[PDB]
Design an enzyme around this catalytic site. Structure first.
Site, PDB file in Angstrom:
ATOM      1  N   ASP A   1      -8.544 -25.822  17.076  1.00 34.07           N
ATOM      2  CA  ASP A   1      -8.855 -27.207  16.877  1.00 34.07           C
ATOM      3  C   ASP A   1      -7.489 -27.936  16.473  1.00 34.07           C
ATOM      4  O   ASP A   1      -7.398 -28.705  15.941  1.00 34.07           O
ATOM      5  CB  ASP A   1      -9.968 -27.638  15.880  1.00 34.07           C
ATOM      6  CG  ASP A   1     -10.405 -29.058  16.252  1.00 34.07           C
ATOM      7  OD1 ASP A   1     -10.358 -29.304  17.407  1.00 34.07           O
ATOM      8  OD2 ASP A   1     -11.111 -29.172  15.419  1.00 34.07           O
TER       9      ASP A   1
ATOM     10  N   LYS B   1      -4.639 -30.252  16.547  1.00 32.90           N
ATOM     11  CA  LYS B   1      -4.418 -31.832  17.010  1.00 32.90           C
ATOM     12  C   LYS B   1      -3.941 -32.512  15.871  1.00 32.90           C
ATOM     13  O   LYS B   1      -4.004 -32.065  14.731  1.00 32.90           O
ATOM     14  CB  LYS B   1      -5.765 -32.547  17.520  1.00 32.90           C
ATOM     15  CG  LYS B   1      -7.145 -32.405  16.401  1.00 32.90           C
ATOM     16  CD  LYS B   1      -8.198 -33.163  17.084  1.00 32.90           C
ATOM     17  CE  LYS B   1      -9.258 -32.719  16.063  1.00 32.90           C
ATOM     18  NZ  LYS B   1     -10.560 -33.592  16.623  1.00 32.90           N
TER      19      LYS B   1
ATOM     20  N   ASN C   1      -5.593 -33.094  12.521  1.00 34.71           N
ATOM     21  CA  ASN C   1      -6.157 -32.088  11.457  1.00 34.71           C
ATOM     22  C   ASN C   1      -4.937 -31.529  10.848  1.00 34.71           C
ATOM     23  O   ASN C   1      -4.908 -30.537  10.085  1.00 34.71           O
ATOM     24  CB  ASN C   1      -6.655 -30.782  12.370  1.00 34.71           C
ATOM     25  CG  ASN C   1      -8.040 -31.129  12.661  1.00 34.71           C
ATOM     26  OD1 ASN C   1      -8.770 -32.248  12.247  1.00 34.71           O
ATOM     27  ND2 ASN C   1      -8.705 -30.337  13.594  1.00 34.71           N
TER      28      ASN C   1
ATOM     29  N   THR D   1     -11.369 -30.254  21.192  1.00 34.96           N
ATOM     30  CA  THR D   1     -11.311 -31.578  21.411  1.00 34.96           C
ATOM     31  C   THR D   1     -10.957 -31.779  22.835  1.00 34.96           C
ATOM     32  O   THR D   1      -9.955 -30.931  23.248  1.00 34.96           O
ATOM     33  CB  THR D   1     -10.492 -32.340  20.487  1.00 34.96           C
ATOM     34  OG1 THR D   1     -10.950 -31.957  19.210  1.00 34.96           O
ATOM     35  CG2 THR D   1     -10.266 -33.807  20.573  1.00 34.96           C
TER      36      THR D   1
END
Ligand SMILES: N[C@H]1CO[C@H]2[C@@H]1OC[C@H]2OC(=O)Nc1cccc(F)c1
Ligand SMILES: N[C@H]1CO[C@H]2[C@@H]1OC[C@H]2OC(=O)Nc1cccc(F)c1
Length: 340
Positions: free
Chosen positions: A156, A158, A161, A191
């Site tokens: 994840d 991005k 985060n 995502t």
């Protein structure tokens, strides 16, 4: 590879496996804390700033509703998240301080990081200069070297985060999709803008998907927008699998070369997934000015320090409707969450 790097990673794996095999459980309860403010939300949980009543220390408390986790098919992912967080230890990972459960909810209490999301600062400034982007990217390269050596995939990456701490360095949060993997794995998660082609095509995939997502992140930090975007996910997916990408003219030639090798559609040719592993990235011309040991030891002065007033200041987070933390008088889904 230098023997000091090999011995560091061997010791890191030994300490991780001891905690992995014997996880901590039940180390506080809800009425040990006062609630201060909701920091943002999601489909099955929320994150709240809280203060511990005895010590006065501030923390970020993630709260997940057990019945919604079951309904959205997230049981195994929630158990992965807490088991991994209580076992890792690295300068650029958020620390888990307590965990517990009650009749309705699961709780993960982490150290509070007052600078807020990297995404907020990126959108306030427009784009990061290449030295600024490179300071953050070097921290992610070292963090993936560590996680991949423990057989973990993060899945994840991005800018939402990545939180910025009081010294201007990154803390990675949200291990909701992280997993320990020998070989290949198959779950569709992540995502859309950051997914590698092999995830979109429903193939068995490996740690190479994290190096693809690092290419998306570095492009976004240096341009101000990600390389693949559209109003519908199916249109994003068509651009990702196509094998093309356009670069702004202000990008350096060294940056373009690094990004062509990370954003490589064929996973068997992608940097990070070749015979030399992470060292094809660390030795690339775009990183020639990086002192890898100085970054790890947190001895480099950061490009930017967030503005805040103290350890409980919420000014770098935004505003959400405040809802109850309700706990049923009957136990819910006890079987499913026995190991938590
Ligand atoms: N834009 C989204 C995603 O991040 C925001 C918002 O909803 C939830 C928020 O998450 C957090 O504040 N988490 C968090 C985690 C650990 C430490 C910490 F200080 C904050
Ligand atoms: N944000 C987290 C991580 O840094 C803080 C905080 O927990 C406590 C501190 O632990 C560390 O410094 N860990 C560490 C240090 C050196 C080498 C290594 F492999 C891990």
């Amino acid at each position: 590879e230098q023997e000091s790097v090999k011995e560091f990673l061997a010791k890191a794996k030994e300490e991780f496996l001891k905690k992995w095999e014997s996880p901590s459980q039940n180390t506080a309860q809800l009425d040990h804390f006062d609630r201060i403010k909701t920091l943002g939300t999601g489909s099955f949980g929320r994150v709240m700033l809280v203060k511990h009543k005895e010590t006065g220390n501030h923390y970020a408390m993630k709260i997940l509703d057990k019945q919604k986790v079951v309904k959205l098919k997230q049981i195994e992912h929630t158990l992965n998240e807490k088991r991994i967080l209580q076992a890792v230890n690295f300068p650029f990972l958020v620390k888990l301080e307590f965990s517990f459960k009650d009749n309705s909810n699961l709780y993960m209490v982490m150290e509070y990081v007052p600078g807020g999301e990297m995404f907020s600062h990126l959108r306030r400034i427009g784009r990061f200069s290449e030295p600024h982007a490179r300071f953050y990217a070097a921290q992610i390269v070292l963090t993936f070297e560590y996680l991949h050596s423990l057989d973990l995939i993060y899945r994840d990456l991005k800018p939402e985060n990545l939180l910025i701490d009081q010294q201007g360095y990154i803390q990675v949060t949200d291990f909701g999709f992280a997993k320990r993997v020998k070989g290949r794995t198959w779950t569709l998660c992540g995502t859309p803008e950051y997914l590698a082609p092999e995830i979109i095509l429903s193939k068995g995939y490996n740690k190479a998907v994290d190096w693809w997502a690092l290419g998306v992140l570095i492009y976004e930090m240096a341009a101000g927008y990600p390389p693949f975007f559209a109003d519908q996910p199916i249109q994003i997916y068509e651009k990702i699998v196509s094998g093309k990408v356009r670069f702004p003219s202000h990008f350096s030639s060294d940056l373009k070369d690094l990004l062509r090798n990370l954003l490589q559609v064929d996973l068997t040719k992608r940097f990070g997934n070749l015979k030399n592993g992470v060292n094809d990235i660390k030795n690339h011309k775009w990183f020639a000015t990086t002192d890898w040991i100085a970054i790890y030891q947190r001895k480099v002065e950061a490009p930017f320090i967030p503005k805040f007033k103290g350890p409980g200041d919420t000014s770098n987070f935004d505003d959400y409707e405040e809802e109850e933390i309700r706990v049923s008088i009957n136990e819910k889904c006890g079987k499913e969450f026995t190991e938590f």
